[PDB]
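Report of the visiting student (M.T.), summer placement. My assignment was to run the structure pipeline on a short list of targets and document each run. The first record concerns Mitrocomin.
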Amino acid sequence: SMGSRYAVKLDTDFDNPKWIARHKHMFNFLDINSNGQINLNEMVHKASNIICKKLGATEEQTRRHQKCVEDFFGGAGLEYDKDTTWPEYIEGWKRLAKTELERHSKNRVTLIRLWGDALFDIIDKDGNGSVSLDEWIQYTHCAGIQQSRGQCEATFAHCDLDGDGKLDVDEMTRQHLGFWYSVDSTCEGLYGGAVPY
Ligand SMILES: O=C1N2C=C(c3ccc(O)cc3)N=C(Cc3ccccc3)C2=N[C@@]1(Cc1ccc(O)cc1)OO
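After the run finished, the structure tokens were exported:
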């Protein structure tokens, strides 16, 4: 949406209702039994036993992806064999967003970039660090985070695509920094409304 030389927004906007609504939407989504809590075991079950198995990851790809998911949700305060409720979750996410943006400001790779690298190694069949529209539909619909083809098309329309019409991990990482962490207006619309704003 801003080209490849766009400088990431590095400050936070945690009291913005759009930020709150994005994470409340995801919390309710992840709270599969609607009991008001989630844990890391559930996140990793989803990641390894559903997403990686169905999308054809090798055992080693699955292991790498799982460590990235552990680290990402662990950075928001989730733990194995311990349950997390919404107020705790959203406070933990303020801490995650802050430490991720701080990492980026210091040229240290982010947990969300490491996750993207691990996921794209599985779902990018050509191997150049970018995914086609059909690969992105398959991932997002298996994860459940997008549910219609039009939402995925909106993601591709929003993002700046490479020469081959594909979504590169560096672009999706920049978009994620602005969508999940800093509330950057230029990243609004990233999930085509499947996740709000
Ligand atoms: O970003 C992504 N996600 C963010 C959250 C999420 C969850 C809770 C929040 O409060 C905020 C965000 N949940 C899921 C889906 C998922 C959840 C749990 C386990 C596996 C997958 C998810 N899938 C990703 C994976 C991804 C990562 C980097 C990329 O470059 C491209 C794709 O793309 O959409």
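The longest helix spans residues 86-105. Residues 23, 26, 43, 46-47, 51, 69, 93, 112, 115-116, 119, 140, 143, 145, 169, 172-173, 176, 180 surround C2-hydroperoxy-coelenterazine (CB under 6 Å). I thank the supervising group for their guidance throughout the placement.
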